Design a binder for these strands. Structure first.
Ligand SMILES: Nc1ncnc2c1ncn2[C@@H]1O[C@H](CSCC[C@H](N)C(=O)O)[C@@H](O)[C@H]1O
Length: 327
DNA sequence: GATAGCGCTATC
DNA sequence: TGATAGCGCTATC
């Protein structure tokens, strides 16, 4: 994550829904905001959240009374994506894990925060011909908020990961917020290699399969993209090896394959999957963040989390706009 | 719970 | 296309 001298969000309170690892909390708190409520129903996510914020989030949101939620100025929510990801069945709102957005909508109608900050995967924008993103837009417009939606790629904001995500920013209409903008991309000066751990600490992640077929020459120079060097098995998800010299592929929560959830990488002549800590780095988490003791649970948590750095630039810009009020 | 083979969709 | 990539799916122990 990035350092922030000017706390655009000082004095503002926020709710952390679908909290997971608390990526949103890290982002807003770095901007001066104050978390007043958090919600995450996964037992393991809860322990990590606690292991890092002292509190345990509240359970199943679909059964929490909105009227119970503390007053807040900014609602944060990176809701479920299984029902919309390019990697899933795309059942959308027909999938039980796909209606969570309306739970948010219910919270907003009740608490009417000054801003609504949401996040989800890229395929969300075009899912079902774009009708899902429209329901969200209208639903928010109908709640009387503006709808700023855009897809950003992490690799464009200082993080070496080809993770493309859609960010939806909504300001309550009564506030004439009209200068909001998404962060301008900037050249990438960091790559996978720069965030790796010493060999001695990842020796155990090294894999060596007879079906390892190297199909491409390691690259000399650093590029701001993913470069496939080889493959294992049929080359399906988690069986593709990339160059640490380029940027990392999109971490996942339920992914399988020998290099499950992180993908394979070529380091000093060896093929291995990323270490939980490296995933953290790949996601923008500060090394001072304590990861869950279960490596599998830890990869899953980072897998469906968010890139702190990106969140920061958006949060800082959210503050900027909210703060511009000339006479 | 942890592990890992997969198989289809979206993109240009 | 044809090649690449995806906060995924789910069977098995
Ligand atoms: N009914 C429900 N109540 C609370 N959390 C729920 C939920 N259904 C799904 N979730 C949670 O939705 C989260 C989506 S992933 C969001 C990750 C988060 N922004 C981060 O930075 O870590 C998951 O952690 C999942 O456990």
């Amino acid at each position: 994550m990035i350092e922030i001298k000017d706390k655009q969000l000082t004095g503002l309170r926020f709710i952390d829904l679908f909290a997971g690892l608390g990526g949103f909390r890290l982002a807003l708190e770095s901007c001066g905001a104050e978390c007043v409520y958090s919600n995450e129903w996964d037992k393991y996510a809860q322990e990590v959240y606690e292991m890092n914020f002292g509190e345990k989030p509240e359970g199943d949101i679909t059964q929490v009374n909105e009227k119970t939620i503390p007053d807040h100025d900014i609602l944060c929510a990176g809701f479920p994506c299984q029902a919309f990801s390019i990697s899933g069945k795309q059942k959308g709102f027909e999938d039980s894990r796909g209606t969570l957005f309306f739970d948010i909508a219910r919270i907003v109608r009740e608490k009417k925060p000054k801003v609504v900050f949401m996040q989800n995967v890229k395929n969300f924008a075009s899912h079902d011909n774009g009708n899902t993103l429209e329901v969200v837009k209208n639903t928010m417009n109908e709640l009387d908020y503006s709808f700023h939606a855009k897809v950003l790629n992490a690799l464009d904001y200082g993080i070496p990961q080809k993770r493309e995500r859609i960010y939806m920013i909504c300001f309550r209409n009564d506030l004439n917020i009209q200068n909001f903008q998404f962060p301008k991309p900037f050249e990438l000066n960091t790559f996978v290699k720069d965030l790796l751990l010493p060999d001695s600490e990842v020796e155990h992640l090294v894999i060596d399969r007879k079906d390892l077929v190297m199909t491409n020459q390691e690259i000399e120079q650093t590029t701001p993209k993913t470069v496939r060097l080889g493959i294992v098995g049929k080359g399906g998800q988690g069986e593709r090896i990339y160059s640490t010299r380029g940027i990392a592929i999109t971490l996942s929560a339920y992914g399988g394959g020998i290099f499950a959830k992180t993908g394979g990488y070529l380091v000093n002549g060896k093929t291995r999957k990323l270490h939980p800590r490296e995933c953290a780095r790949v996601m923008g988490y500060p090394d001072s963040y304590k990861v869950h003791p279960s490596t599998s649970q830890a990869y899953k948590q980072f897998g469906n989390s968010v890139v702190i750095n990106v969140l920061q630039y958006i949060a800082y810009n959210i503050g900027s706009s909210l703060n511009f009020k000339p006479y």
